[PDB]
Ligand binder design. Structure first.
Ligand SMILES: CC[C@@H](Nc1c(Nc2ccnc(C(=O)N(C)C)c2O)c(=O)c1=O)c1cc(C(C)C)co1
Length: 471
């Protein structure tokens, strides 16, 4: 029956994990050079999967006939399969902690004191053994009426020893993983800009001289400048908020002190309102033309402030470009924009309020009195921090975690469903199908490195070239 197939898959995975993880441990251990804190954690993960692989042929014979191998051998096998999970899930959380402090925050960890990394994973294996200590007490050979011997568990303390590793060995590292991986992915998405195009170095002369010449080119008098480079639309780029803010500013004396440049094509009702304001005020300029990135670069450097009153912005790409050339952004607190803009690098406002934006334009007017040379420079530093990219290296780790959860989450979710049922054939075969999914993981990580793992790929053929391989 289905029993023959199980033994095939078990023997098939066993080999793919043995060779797989052994190759991975070799490639990591061969050269100490270039090996990172993450490479150390991935090496421990490879060993955790390598140990669990060893129990698979004993588990294969356990399907044909029951658990005959011994009461002791149950504890041996049961500890390795539990330790492999708790260690593997905790090692993945340590990768998250390292990558969070390194990508979303600009802080390298344990680089100077690399000896401490060894103690971290030693602690991981230890905590993993203590988490799996109750199964060393309650897991043995269980005999029943007319059925083959089996390997499974059986007071109030026994449930506590099952509830304690359920939350601290599954939910606690998972919680840390969701916060860290989630917020790293968020900032990973944001940087798409190339500092080879948008840079301060490419600009000629000084930012105040570039401004006076821009105004002279735009037929406007000397003063503080505000720029808009979004699309003319309702409910997305919020040009209507800007045209209404200009309208309420119109009545004030401080309005004559400032100049406005509203660039963008779109909505004919918004195009009209922008042209009417241009024709009425000598300090308002509107460009319907679709300008080239070379001209926009000259604008970002010369103009003092860039206003982004966008209702929805998933990525602050227009702010990233503006900040890379040293323009203080007056953007509404929305997606991407709340993250990139700090009280040190721009002004944040309420999304759909034209009254509050006018007060931010007025606030920016008063802040310009003092030399904002450092404030403009801070924006260049902050945008650039986002500019550095690891995104390609991380694509491997995201595949690792994605596949880990796709293999272990269905087993743990079915585990809760059958334990809380006490406290069916459809749910019995469900646990039989989620079992083989968690087994398949044991050989998947090496395959991921063999597919998209750029350090492992090159590193493996680097060793092959040293000994055998040629041309
Ligand atoms: C799985 C084995 C493989 N490790 C790999 C990656 N790891 C990393 C992934 C993301 N971020 C880091 C990191 O934290 N930084 C500081 C770059 C990694 O290290 C890969 O990508 C990849 O492949 C490897 C490494 C080596 C040598 C360097 C010893 C040989 O094989």
């Amino acid at each position: 029956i289905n029993k023959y197939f199980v033994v095939i898959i078990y023997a098939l995975v066993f080999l793919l994990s043995l060779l797989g993880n052994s190759l991975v441990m070799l490639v990591i251990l061969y050269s100490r050079v270039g090996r990172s804190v993450t490479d150390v954690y991935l090496l421990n993960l490879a060993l955790a999967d390598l140990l669990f692989a060893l129990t698979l042929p004993i588990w294969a014979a356990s399907k044909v006939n029951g658990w005959i191998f011994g009461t002791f051998l149950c504890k041996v096998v049961s500890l390795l399969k539990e330790v492999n999970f708790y260690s593997g899930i905790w090692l993945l959380a340590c990768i998250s902690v390292d990558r969070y402090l390194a990508i979303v925050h600009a802080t390298r960890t344990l680089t100077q004191k690399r000896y401490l990394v060894k103690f971290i994973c030693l602690s991981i294996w230890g905590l993993s053994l203590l988490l799996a200590l109750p199964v060393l007490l309650f897991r043995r050979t269980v005999y029943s009426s007319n059925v083959s011997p089996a390997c499974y568990e059986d007071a109030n303390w026994r449930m506590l020893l099952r509830i304690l590793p359920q939350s601290f060995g599954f939910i606690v590292p998972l919680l840390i993983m969701l916060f860290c991986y989630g917020f790293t992915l968020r900032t990973l998405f944001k940087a798409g800009i190339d500092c080879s195009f948008w840079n301060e170095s490419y600009l000629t002369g000084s930012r105040d001289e570039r401004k006076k010449s821009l105004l002279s080119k735009f037929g406007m008098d000397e003063g503080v400048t505000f720029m808009f480079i979004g699309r003319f639309d309702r409910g997305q780029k919020g040009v209507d908020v800007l045209l209404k803010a200009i309208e309420i500013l119109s009545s004030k004396k401080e309005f004559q002190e400032m100049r406005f440049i509203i660039i963008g094509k779109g909505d004919p009702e918004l195009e009209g309102w922008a042209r009417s304001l241009e024709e009425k005020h000598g300090n308002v300029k509107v460009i319907t033309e679709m300008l080239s990135r070379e001209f926009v670069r000259e604008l970002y450097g010369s103009v003092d402030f860039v206003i982004i009153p966008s209702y929805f912005e998933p990525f602050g790409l227009v702010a990233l470009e503006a900040m890379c050339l040293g323009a203080i952004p007056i953007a509404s607190a929305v997606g991407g924009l709340r993250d990139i803009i700090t009280n040190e690098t721009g002004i944040l406002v309420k999304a759909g309020d034209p009254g509050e934006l006018a007060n931010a334009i007025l606030k920016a007017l008063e802040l310009s009195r003092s030399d904002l040379s450092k404030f403009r420079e801070n924006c260049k530093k902050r945008a650039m921090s986002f500019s550095g990219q690891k995104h390609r290296e991380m694509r491997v780790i995201f595949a690792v975690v994605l596949i880990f959860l796709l293999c272990w989450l269905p087993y743990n979710l079915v585990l809760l469903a059958d334990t809380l049922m006490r406290t069916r054939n459809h749910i019995d075969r469900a646990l039989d199908a989620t079992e083989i999914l968690a087994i398949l993981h044991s050989c998947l990580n090496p395959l991921i490195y063999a597919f998209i793992g750029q350090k492992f790929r090159h590193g493996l053929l680097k060793i092959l070239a040293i000994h055998g391989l040629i041309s």
